[PDB]
């Protein structure tokens, strides 16, 4: 019945708050929170702007070696109690001619909401 | 517990079959199937290699105006009703493509609720 439980209000606001935590950690390079919010599994993956990383271990390892931006559109959708997508467009003044996209899928784990897969890319429109 | 229901094999096989359908439709430009497999909702979105499309209507409208080798595939299912599918692909020898999808079990079957495609060096 997931399609008749879209954007439930407690669920939608919870995922929103975690997304905001993620975005603030990204712009301050708070790697501990960036890692905290990724699902600790070998299945977790991140297709980043410059590389592809498979598994939590690879992602967390990358974060240790790797900033401000404006979000211009956001769609956060929740499906039932335990799953969600968060999609944003963004821009940086450093690269005026490009538009960034970031997609995340989130799952309610027994330690909270975590990102299970993410993809980031910048394109010219 | 959802964490203890990763890649259940019945569920994983369902999602995999639809993903295969999607890939064959993409390579034959079978737009009917490509649209059939996207969630028919205004929330559905596709960040494509060259444009951003919001809502099923925009996506299906784009498909009406529009070969590759898959090099790595990860399909993961969570419980009975949700899944992700991620692939790397190549066609342009200097670039590697990524395609990410999230799938949900709807009352008409498994559908893609969001997707992102991009190519990098």
Residue numbers in the entry:
A (entry chain A): 1 to 66, 71 to 129
B (entry chain B): 1 to 66, 72 to 96, 99 to 128
Reported in the publication:
We obtained the X-ray crystal structure of the AtzH. Differential Scanning Fluorimetry (DSF) was used to estimate the stability of the protein and showed that the native protein had a Tm of 57.2°C. Well diffracting crystals of AtzH grew readily, and two different space groups were observed: P1 and C2221. X-ray diffraction data were collected for both. Analysis with PISA gives an interfacial surface area of almost 3,200 Å2 (or about 29% of the total surface area of the protein). The AtzH active site was sought by examining the X-ray structure. However, an in silico docking simulation between the X-ray crystal structure of the AtzH dimer and 1,3-dicarboxyurea elucidated a potential active site. Tyr22 is positioned within 3 Å of the carbonyl carbon of one of the two terminal carboxylic acids, and Arg46 is within hydrogen-bonding distance of the hydroxyl group of Tyr22. Tyr22 and Arg46 are therefore well positioned to form a catalytic dyad, albeit one of atypical composition.
The data presented here imply that AtzH is a decarboxylating, 1,3-dicarboxyurea amidohydrolase. AtzH belongs to NTF2-fold superfamily, which contains 38 protein families, including the AtzH family: DUF3225 (DUF: domain of unknown function). Size exclusion chromatography performed on AtzH after removal of the his-tag, suggested that the native protein had a molecular mass of ~ 29 kDa, consistent with a dimer (2 x 14,655 kDa).
